[PDB]
Design a protein around this ligand. Sequence first.
Ligand SMILES: NC(=[NH2+])NCCC[C@H](N)C(=O)O
Length: 238
Amino acid sequence: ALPQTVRIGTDTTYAPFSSKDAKGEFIGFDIDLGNEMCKRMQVKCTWVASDFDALIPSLKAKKIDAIISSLSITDKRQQEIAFSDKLYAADSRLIAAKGSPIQPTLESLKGKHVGVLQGSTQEAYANDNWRTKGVDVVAYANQDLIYSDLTAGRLDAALQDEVAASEGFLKQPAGKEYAFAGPSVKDKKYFGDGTGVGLRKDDTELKAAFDKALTELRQDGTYDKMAKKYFDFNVYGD
Ligand SMILES: NC(=[NH2+])NCCC[C@H](N)C(=O)O
């Protein structure tokens, strides 16, 4: 038996996947997916906002039951928690000022100030490959502070999910004078294989129900109808 109310944690600072509208209500693709799956699962769902780096600890502590927050499915995370089937693809890419020669390389980022989300796969990658080697990698409680430090010049570059940067910043007025700096960063190990619903390992029935709802809403075309609100491309991937 699934719980009468499935509590879903999300970090609402990652448009267009999860953010807040003017009323403070949860909006974005993650929210739409979550709500549609819950509908099909015939359970009530209650969204819970928290910082991104608090989601997996909250899940483990049973303060929430699920995470839908562009949570990348990684080898390392799977040693701690479970995942539903893939919700959508997620690649990492740097952003910087328009015209920046910055590339996702150690040589290019020497003496540069680079922002990453605390508890993200991007922080993991940046800390290991760049911060130890002298690059000023700065971790942030949330992505909106990163964008703001970038636009104010405190940061030279930021590393986050490509689609989030693109739709949530670059294509917005705030990011008109900014661009991707270099191609997406390739690293299977660190960045994983798309995003999924984060779940406790022993909640097998809940995972199965999420997986069932997801397959069904993909199959009947509801996934693509919801995605078109945000994207003119195949957000799902392969
Ligand atoms: N709602 C968010 N802030 N999501 C951040 C996700 C970034 C990256 N995909 C990760 O799992 O670490």
